[PDB]
Design a protein around this ligand. Structure first.
Ligand SMILES: C/C=C(/C)C(=O)O[C@H]1C(C)=C2[C@H]([C@@H]1OC(=O)CCCCCCC)[C@@](C)(OC(C)=O)C[C@H](OC(=O)CCC)[C@@]1(O)[C@H]2OC(=O)[C@@]1(C)O
Ligand code: ALF
Ligand SMILES: [K+]
Ligand SMILES: [Mg+2]
Length: 994
């Protein structure tokens, strides 16, 4: 319950009323366990099987198609004759498709997995507590510990709950809290109060956080909070909440699915106004049962003409293809929808350590004393190449390599690094790369030697495995490490007492090798090493050294520096108390300064040009890290996020600072700041939300669990391939190769897909505007229906399907990565395109019904009932207006419809070749520029002549036509559409632009 790391240990105990020595009593554990509950994170329970099936059903797109398919039963029963058992295919097929959309859609909900579960993997099973009923410590279930009881932790343990350190038994406590800062560096705790209320995790040096593990030492503390009220418990709470929003495209489809509903609901009320021929014109005559199906039969037909149910099928297949495509470029997408959103990305938020950097400490600079004369001190600076722990680099003076051994000082520099170091390198045979063993800040020195190769020992022939410790192995031979004075906060340094090899009885030859914070170690040096000689430490030589240290640890090259010294004449081995660290400082006195090393977790090789590529595509890249501002800014200046001299004083905040800005100032800082450092997991998330409060599509790139809350928050979570499982689990996309450059490639691919997608969506829907105009006409006049929903489904699912989907392969425009991000506000159809389709809509809305009055009015090989009053009487419920009457059911012939249906099917093959572009006539847009588009159309008109000749088929769809001329008739009703369009473009391509 207690949320203070700012109180004394004595006050914290007082808080819970527990003794540091005894521990909680049974009664207290009864009440605390009561008031606070168990120490465990709640699991989010996954897919609700009744709520993944329901999501597919609740969208007017299926609601309307439902009532319709359902009304296709009310009107399915009313049919005299045996033609009622062979007239349920329509209501059948209809529903059957809504089932396919359900099945198909659902199957791709690939969040297969639990990030919350992945997180819980950080809560240990057991914990160690001290409670009143026993003197010995007890190992209980971690979920049984409560705020208030004394807990004990040590080397290897995984902190069971947020704890306030009360006492450190080891001379120091080394904790690894990357799980909350993304940094593996071990942090050194203490038990003093941290005064700042608003302190961040990176500040609570007197707290132990649930989920982190103890790198070194043993300690005693009091449990401050448990379960959901802990830092990792917060990450958990932020993940649970956040849900992904509908795609910019999905969105368009939504508003559309609403209007499309408002429209029809009015088109019907519009026919009830025109067709008041059953409310104020006729007589008694029954039409309240027969002519009553003229207000329902068109209801379930008007629906299938507005709802392009088949569009989903196209996108899904399109996206799925993109997936595998990107997967070849090394980006594994786990959710299709983000594939489209990835195209329109304006902001990429990114983690530093392990994402933009390799996360492998490296010694990149080092220097030794060169020359001394009073008041003049010159050094010998050096640079080291290599960004990995791999011994893959060479040292070099003035950008030109120089064998280290030819320099005496560097022989000692290298010796201290190898000897005063409790870590090691190691080639992982499986993964195929070297990895560190111990403190990464130390393994950096281990690798530094293998590179320095001071004794020239041959290592070129060695195995990749054994060359890992070659040069260091040698050095171990040269000197025997006796014992090592640990590191202590009071001296910020450590040491190793060593003795000359092959010397058994003598006194002389021994020496200690020291390392640590420059300031402190330097001050304890009375002599400086000059190659092999040794001269005293004067003010001029002091400041000189310091100067370079000061520059090296703050510039555009902020580096962690270590002073390296040696005590030539260490005290008598039997004159030291090796059990009292408080005495190590004096044993580390009268030292001889040797050199300085500069570390850094360097940028991945390709990040700089990747950042550039984003800049060109007008995408902003913001860095958000748990590491320190000093370091973040220096990485941004190398990565290219900041220019080398660019004033940054107002566009790079630390989490604390940022918490201090007003809400308004914050939202604003997000648009200008590009570097937020020393943040907590929530800060990352927060910044993303603000960035999203500008309608911007934001991406989050990370590899840590501290990156989880923002990954789940961005429109697109991108985890590293080498990242943590939880980060991966929370992302929509993974980088199989860890190269920040593949994000660039993925954005490209996504841009290209979004275009082509946009095409088949304005093509496959435009048709519906024609199908609806067609129906509305053939009902606002009274004419015989030329098209029935049954056919209106094949045409939209296959007939249009194949073409529409061929457009998805539209050749990606060249120079598509030099254009800014598509604005989310931008509707797919508005302006002149709204009219161009508003035009191509009316044309087909007519040319289909008119094809019907060609088999009746202008009828040659058919019922030439030239102006027989289709509008007036189609009824024929007395053959009186016709003398010689004995046949009126010709208004039901399968030919007047096989026209509109053939025209339609033929018009769409055109618009498909017309929609291969937006402002480019087919003369500049050759139809053969899309191989798959030609084949599709072939495949289309070849499916028409299938459901037109295959005996069973036309039985269900209605009867044939001979190419006589009737087909040629269908042509001069469609083909001109091409001309019409080709013109509408020139009207824009020139009158609007060019
Ligand atoms: C599917 C068929 C029809 C007829 C329809 O109702 O679509 C309108 C409509 C609701 C929109 C319009 C349609 O506008 C009309 O055709 C007006 C009605 C004329 C029919 C009456 C007989 C004369 C879309 C379809 O078409 C054309 C050709 O102008 C394009 C676009 O749609 C999209 O971006 C959706 C893509 C997923 C939307 O303007 C959209 O409104 C929006 O908010 C958008 C941005 O959604
Ligand atoms: F590795 Al980080 F913030 F978690 F840069
Ligand atoms: K997300
Ligand atoms: Mg990280």
């Amino acid at each position: 319950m207690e949320a203070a790391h700012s109180k004394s240990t004595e006050e914290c105990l007082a808080y819970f009323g527990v003794s540091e020595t005894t521990g909680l009593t049974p009664d207290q554990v009864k009440r605390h366990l009561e008031k606070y509950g168990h120490n465990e994170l709640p699991a989010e329970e996954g897919k609700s099987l009744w709520e993944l099936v329901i999501e597919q059903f609740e969208d007017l797109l299926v609601r309307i198609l439902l009532l319709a398919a359902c009304i296709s039963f009310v009107l399915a029963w009313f049919e005299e004759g045996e033609e009622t058992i062979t007239a349920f295919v329509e209501p059948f097929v209809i529903l059957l498709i809504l089932i396919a959309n359900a099945i198909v859609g659902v199957w791709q909900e690939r969040n297969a997995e639990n990030a919350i579960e992945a997180l819980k993997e950080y809560e240990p099973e057991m914990g160690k507590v001290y409670r009143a009923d026993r003197k010995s410590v007890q190992r209980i279930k971690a979920r049984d510990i409560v705020p208030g009881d004394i807990v004990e932790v040590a080397v290897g343990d995984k902190v069971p709950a947020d704890i306030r350190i009360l006492s450190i038994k080891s001379t120091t406590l080394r904790v690894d809290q990357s799980i909350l800062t993304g940094e593996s560096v071990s942090v050194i705790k203490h038990t003093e109060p941290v005064p700042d209320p608003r302190a961040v995790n990176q500040d609570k040096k007197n707290m132990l956080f649930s989920g982190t593990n103890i790198a070194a030492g043993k300690a005693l503390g009091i449990v401050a909070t448990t379960g959901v009220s802990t830092e990792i418990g917060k990450i958990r709470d932020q993940m649970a909440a956040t849900e992904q929003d509908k795609t910019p495209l999905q969105q368009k489809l939504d508003e559309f699915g609403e209007q499309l509903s408002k429209v029809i609901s009015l088109i019907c009320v519009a026919v009830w106004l025109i067709n008041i021929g059953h409310f104020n014109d006729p007589v008694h005559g029954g039409s309240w049962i027969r002519g009553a199906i003229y207000y329902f039969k068109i209801a379930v037909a008007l629906a299938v003409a507005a709802i392009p149910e088949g569009l989903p099928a196209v996108i899904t297949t399109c996206l799925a293809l993109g997936t595998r495509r990107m997967a070849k470029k090394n980006a594994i997408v786990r959710s299709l929808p983000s594939v489209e959103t990835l195209g329109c990305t304006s902001v990429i938020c990114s983690d530093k350590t392990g994402t933009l950097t390799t996360n492998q400490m490296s010694v990149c600079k080092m220097f030794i004393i060169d020359k001394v004369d009073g008041d003049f001190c010159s050094l010998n600076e050096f640079s080291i190449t290599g960004s990995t722990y791999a011994p893959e680099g060479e040292v070099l003076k003035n950008d030109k390599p120089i064998r280290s051994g030819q320099f005496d000082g560097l022989v000692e520099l290298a010796t201290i690094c190898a000897l005063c170091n409790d870590s090691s390198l190691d080639f992982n045979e499986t993964k195929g790369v070297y990895e560190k063993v111990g403190e990464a800040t130390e393994t950096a020195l281990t690798t530094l030697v293998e590179k320095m190769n001071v004794f020239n020992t041959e290592v070129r022939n060695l195995s990749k495995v054994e060359r890992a410790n070659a040069c260091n192995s040698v050095i171990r031979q040269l000197m025997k490490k006796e014992f090592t004075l640990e590191f202590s906060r009071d001296r910020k340094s450590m040491s190793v007492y060593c003795s000359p090899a092959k010397s058994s009885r003598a006194a002389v030859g021994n020496k200690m090798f020291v390392k640590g914070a420059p300031e402190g170690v330097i001050d304890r040096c009375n002599y400086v090493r000059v190659g092999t000689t040794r001269v005293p430490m004067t003010g001029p030589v002091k400041e000189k050294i310091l100067s370079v240290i000061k520059e090296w640890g703050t510039g555009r090259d902020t580096l962690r520096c270590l002073a390296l010294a040696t005590r030539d004449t260490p005290p008598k081995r039997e004159e030291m108390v090796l059990d009292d660290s408080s005495r190590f400082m004096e044993y580390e006195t009268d030292l001889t300064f040797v050199g300085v090393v500069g570390m850094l977790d360097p940028p991945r090789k390709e990040v700089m040009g990747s950042i550039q590529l984003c800049r060109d595509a007008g995408i902003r890249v913001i860095m958000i890290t748990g590491d320190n501002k000093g370091t973040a800014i220096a990485i941004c200046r190398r990565i290219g996020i900041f220019g080398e001299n660019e004033e940054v004083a107002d566009r790079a905040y630390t989490g604390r600072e940022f918490d201090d800005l007003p809400l308004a100032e914050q939202r604003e800082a997000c648009r200008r700041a590009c570097c937020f450092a020393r943040v907590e997991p929530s800060h990352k998330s927060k910044i993303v939300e603000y960035l999203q409060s500008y309608d911007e599509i934001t991406a989050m790139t990370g590899d840590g669990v501290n990156d989880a809350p923002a990954l789940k928050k961005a429109e697109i979570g991108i985890a590293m391939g080498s990242g943590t499982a939880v980060a991966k689990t929370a992302s929509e996309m993974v980088l199989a190769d860890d190269n920040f450059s593949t994000i660039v490639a993925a954005v490209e691919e996504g841009r290209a897909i979004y275009n082509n997608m946009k095409q088949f969506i304005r093509y496959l829907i435009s048709s519906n505007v024609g199908e609806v105009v067609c129906i509305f006409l053939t009902a606002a006049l009274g004419l015989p229906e030329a098209l029935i929903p049954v056919q209106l489904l094949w045409v939209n699912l296959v007939t249009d399907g194949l073409p529409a989907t061929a457009l998805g392969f539209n050749p990606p425009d060249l120079d598509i990565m030099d254009r800014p991000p598509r604005s989310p506000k931008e509707p797919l159809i508005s302006g002149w395109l709204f009219f161009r389709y508003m035009a191509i809509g009316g044309y087909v809305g007519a040319a289909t019904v008119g094809a019907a009055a060609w088999w009746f009015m202008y009828a040659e090989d058919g019922p030439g009932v030239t102006y027989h009053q289709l509008t007036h009487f189609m009824q024929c419920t007395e053959d009186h207006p016709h003398f010689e009457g004995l046949d009126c059911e010709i208004f039901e012939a399968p030919e007047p419809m096989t026209m509109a249906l053939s025209v339609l099917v033929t018009i769409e093959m055109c618009n498909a070749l017309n929609s291969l572009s937006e402002n480019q006539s087919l003369m500049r847009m050759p139809p053969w520029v899309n191989i798959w588009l030609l084949g599709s159309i072939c495949l289309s008109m070849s499916l028409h002549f299938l459901i037109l000749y295959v005996d069973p088929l036309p039985m269900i769809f209605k009867l044939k036509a001979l190419d006589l001329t009737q087909w040629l008739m269908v042509l001069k009703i469609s083909l001109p559409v091409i001309g019409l369009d080709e013109i509408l473009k020139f009207i824009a391509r020139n009158y609007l632009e060019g």
